[PDB]
Amino acid sequence: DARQRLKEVEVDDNGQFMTTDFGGNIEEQFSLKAGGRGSTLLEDFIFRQKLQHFDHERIPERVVHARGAGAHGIFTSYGDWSNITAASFLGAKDKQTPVFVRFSTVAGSRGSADTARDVHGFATRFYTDEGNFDIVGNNIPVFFIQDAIRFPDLIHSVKPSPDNEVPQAATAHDSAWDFFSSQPSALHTLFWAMSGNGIPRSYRHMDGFGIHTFRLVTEDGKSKLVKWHWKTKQGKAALVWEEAQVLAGKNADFHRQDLWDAIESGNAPSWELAVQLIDEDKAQAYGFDLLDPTKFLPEEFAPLQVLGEMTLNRNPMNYFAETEQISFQPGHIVRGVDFTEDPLLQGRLYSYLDTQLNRHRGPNFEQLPINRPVSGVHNNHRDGQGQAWIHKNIHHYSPSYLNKGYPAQANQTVGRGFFTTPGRTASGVLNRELSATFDDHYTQPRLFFNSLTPVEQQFVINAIRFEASHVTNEQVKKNVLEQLNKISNDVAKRVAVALGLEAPQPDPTYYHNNVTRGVSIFNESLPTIATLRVGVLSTTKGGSLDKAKALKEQLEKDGLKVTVIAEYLASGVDQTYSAADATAFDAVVVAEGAERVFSGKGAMSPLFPAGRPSQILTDGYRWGKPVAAVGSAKKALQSIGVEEKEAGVYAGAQDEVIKGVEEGLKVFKFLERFAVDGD
Amino acid sequence: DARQRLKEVEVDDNGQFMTTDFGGNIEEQFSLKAGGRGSTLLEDFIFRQKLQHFDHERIPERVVHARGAGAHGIFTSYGDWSNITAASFLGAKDKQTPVFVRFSTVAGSRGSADTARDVHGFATRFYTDEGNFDIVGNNIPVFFIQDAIRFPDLIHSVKPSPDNEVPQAATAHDSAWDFFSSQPSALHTLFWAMSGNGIPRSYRHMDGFGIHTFRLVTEDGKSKLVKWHWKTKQGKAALVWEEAQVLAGKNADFHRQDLWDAIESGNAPSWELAVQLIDEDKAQAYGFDLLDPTKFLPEEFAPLQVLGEMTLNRNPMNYFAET
């Protein structure tokens, strides 16, 4: 049980009498009044203590990544990695360390939709026996900017316009694309966000990245450059934009519910932790500077070496106390790891510690149960708001004769202390500049675009076409085109069509045809279809419901989550047509006999909106899902102009339909149904 | 200009050089580094002051009605109402008073959709020459509960489940309908929220209500029981649920954009302020108790008397500082 240490702070209210926050049993359903129909008395201490706590329930949301969700788990190391790092949690084969991970979007506030197009956070805390170690990462290996002093500029430009606070959780407005084109370093992460990484199917179907180059340090001080990677054991999967838009309204909690259900049903998701290891003398050997967070290291130059696996198998008990209150920091570093001179990483170390003072209104946020380490805290810090401990050592200073030298200093040689990499040097003038090695903003965006499948490339262009069409300012649109043309003339030409602007002349300075592995989503089938959802469209009339039940029973044998849909909640029905939508499912199958609700009077009922069964099947097909119909239900496919000839469409007997749908779920999205420019 | 008093705190940065918050011109696009590819210096005061302010931008959202939008305007009285109230802002015909109004949902957090099904807030401030007077009302004339000590129970049950924080901005979960059926007083507002009032076309197409019976008092102390009413001059209009759902995803800012667009285009919305006036000795004479906020007074028993009109004609300059 990963949450084991949290047991001593859990409060059970079962069978208990109601109390105030200072003890004493009470009733609190009536205000104390002066007479039968009289005013409430100020001396009603019960009312005021109950309502004061309600009035003060909220804390400020995270300044970025406000919308998110998390879970507990365990990390297991695959070996003794002391030859590359002194980190204790990586220091023995099969060694286990509790973790908590929080996934998120970036721009939207609390309560914005999960399926907005955005970069996604992927923050992992290791509760190691030598302190808390956080990998505060994203699902995209590169970031928008090269210097941390520019973060407020990027965030202000993406977040809503400060006059009317429009739009929510979206980059599709003038200020964001004014910034992207004025700060060309942002074009790389932009392309990733316009790809499937911007609209992932679920938290469980994302890779993770530390982005920054860090250092792993051995006991003697020898260091290697390192990139952190999380490889999902569930496979990467993404939606299409027109689907994520509807899903944002039909279920804003799509991703957090997906993670909760997977853990509750015993289908805990897993990620393997992997690293790219680079010698210090190769920091600028691969066509870019590894101190530059706008570039990633192609796996051809350095393969992914997996060190262990992380599995998230415990949901939180109280969302606010655990998920909302947890405070990640890249400064949460342990012996065996060190920073690099990444100018973006450097400023993060200040911002995360400082921002906790705003979110928690005090300096003792590390004493909260979700932030406490398991390894023990011994220093001379005292007081502060909400001080929860009582310190025994009255000689709270060092050096000191009276405290006998305790707590004692720890360094590289005594006490397993943290230490900066011994060989790191400073040389040159104090400057407010960036290295000229950071100047290429176009090569790797082109490299990323080259490494996607044709339809995958079309998704990227259709995302840019959608977003840039929201820009009202003509010159900003031209600025965007001019910057896109430096990455690829064909991309700029194809985007220019939607904008009604002229196809610009090629600027080939950064054009190239190189490709790299591991960045595409749609070029690989899923390794498992467990937890994937199948919507079964049925009806309470006839014998459709009994066949749907048998269909459901066989689908569930393969680990699928099956929802039978009918007009009302008859026996065996999981959801009404009124509450159903294709966005909730990964496959849509029509049960035999249910074709009666796709035309005629069966399609016109007060129990659901007109055309809802046909809308669900139409949505599921046009969004690239596997769609099916059993037996006579092929009339439902015919009613929407779909033939069994097509890939991802299945008809016939029940067994043939189950096999076809289960194979189609590995493909997940059938890209044959999406038109490409000039096809 | 309704916002005329706010101009003295407005800051124009056009044609100016970047500064810190304590003055002095600066550049803030490069951190100070010790060497060409070196670490950032703690002495970079420029970086830390700019990033500290960013790190501390957020304040707690409202515990309820966190999602909303507002605008400035003018309230104009239709008469000298001194025979029913001593309130200065109603003391003369054509008397004008600046206002600010915020419309909102209730359950959803800051970034939730405008077209979620919910009770809607309708909060009005009159900046009168005898103090600020607020009518903090809703677009529905009755409330769920009869005693304020039960408010945390209602809100907890409607807001997301505390284990996973699901669902956002929705009453369609177990805990809400547990409370509705366990506290039957909630059924009246429930029915209003399940009607078109729960999914209005826009803020401009809602009526407003103070819900509570208040008192109007004259200079010598004669009192009347009063219900506040806002009557939209744009007409009441609502969506249908299957449409509001898609709109929640296609444009979560549908209502705040609608209000902003109407004001910017010169189509300022208006509401008439109307009242029902009841004698003190008839507080229990209309088939219910007028101290009960789960009941409204049918207009057949007491028709509306209109006191004036309010027009919202100025959008805010900074949403955070104002709205």
Place this chain on the structure above:
Amino acid sequence: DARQRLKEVEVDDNGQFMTTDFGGNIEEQFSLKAGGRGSTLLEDFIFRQKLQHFDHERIPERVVHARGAGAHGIFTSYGDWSNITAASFLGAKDKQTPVFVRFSTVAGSRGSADTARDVHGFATRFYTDEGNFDIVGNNIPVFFIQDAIRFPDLIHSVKPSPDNEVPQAATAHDSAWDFFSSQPSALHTLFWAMSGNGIPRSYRHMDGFGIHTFRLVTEDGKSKLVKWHWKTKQGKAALVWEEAQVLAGKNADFHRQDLWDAIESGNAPSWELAVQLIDEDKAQAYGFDLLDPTKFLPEEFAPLQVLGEMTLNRNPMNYFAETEQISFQPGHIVRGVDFTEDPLLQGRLYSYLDTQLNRHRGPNFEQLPINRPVSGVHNNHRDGQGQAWIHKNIHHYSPSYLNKGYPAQANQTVGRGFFTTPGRTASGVLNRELSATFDDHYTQPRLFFNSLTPVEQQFVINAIRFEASHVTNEQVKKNVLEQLNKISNDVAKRVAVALGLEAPQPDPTYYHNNVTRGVSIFNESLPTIATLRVGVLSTTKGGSLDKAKALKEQLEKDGLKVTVIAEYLASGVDQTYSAADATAFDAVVVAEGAERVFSGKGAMSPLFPAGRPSQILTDGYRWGKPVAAVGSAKKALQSIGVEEKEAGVYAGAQDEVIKGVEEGLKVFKFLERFAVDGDDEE
């Protein structure tokens, strides 16, 4: 161990390596720099996490009673008091309840002197098994004002002037006496503060009062009006003002060190909890309204009935986490107690809850270890800044089918819930007025002054003379005289002398000669001299030291704390003359042979200021302390002009001096050394 429950949050750093606040061993004595003589790096996470916690150590001081100190202890009930209250902690003989008590002044800020003249706080928390019960009291039985809405006005006027923040922890300025004379209800507490109650010898030598009339309620709902009393087992004792002033500079921690020393040495102080009980139908039967907080009930009308005793025997381990962070509330009420319509108490209930939001900045301050009850918290409260628990019940609302009705309602008949006194009613118009029964502002101030000894009365008049002479506005001083004249014409006349104002004519509307017991300090000797301090003046020359240590050993047998003073820290010396002052002792005895440092060569030394040994003996005598000299040390008494057989002066051999000094410590202050108005006449 009253602190037993706090052991689970105690952190022991001995034998450990330094860590950050998120774990991991570190060194934190050098900043990370870019080069040997280079700038500090932003990536020094160790420096910033250490200095951030330092930068944010302070929390707002209490808006009033900012200066004070406290301790843990145990309260023991003397019987089963279910016949008068359903309160659990009073429900059985020898039933024990942990307590924390904080004593304080009122006006001064965090670092002000203990021995300023002020009302003194006396706040007790009972950690009962049915919730925390707080008696937030003072060492004076009446308060300045009659309605809580006037509290900001009283406090603003007593606290420093808002333009320069002068004076600290003092009522001797214009605005304070402008308010006392403009709001005549303040005159009763004024007189108490101008007496010995304003300058007590220690926290342990104070009585305590809940001030307000409260209600005791039995299981069946029967109620009685009640006044809370704390009666010190150490006896009441006070200083003189000219002594308190010097002590304010010589040791600003005099009272908190006294309490700490007494507990550390095994001399835990004790108070008895006593009540006055009044029938509901007699609330206005004793010459005043018992809802009026400016009045106390004379013990002749209702005697004190002891219910138990409280003993404070454990010092805090961390002052901040315990004493500074503890949050008292009169709203901390339990089953068996109820409020009254005392308009001062009524507003307190709102203010103490609200003010914690400023001091603790978050609604979860009751989760702090020192504020937590021992009885268990079960409700549907959630979230809030700094939420320290993880609630299991996901159906956090009532009523509810899903949570099976739990946590469940508790009332008078079910679950031993709190219930308001069932017989209380409201009747009349909603009003912003005060009951005319509150109108008398002068009778009881006169009763209090009538009940002090003659020299005790002179201390009150001399305190007023000192304070009012600081008032610069002429009219305010005249306004003060007119108000004083309504209490006592002779008081106004003796005060008028110091102010150079004419003796006002009698205004006998409220004059009377009644007296009452239990309000005087100097008319009763102390029941014990334990912990009382003796300063033995000695010297390092000759054999004075060896005799001074024999004197110390005998004195210590009787429970006294003895300080042997000499020119330097020789063997057997506790304190140097440079570090010594008479304010730190209750008696001063010159050891035989030490007369050499009172005159001539031995009195002129670079090791202490000029005349220091003579000044200690002079201060000790002039401030009314028992003073003594052994054998040849009688020369020291003669050098300052003190006759060897005055009252409280003891000369002779060692055994005689010990005998006389211990007897004089019971008298404590020798009042015939203070001139009374009319003594200097011819």
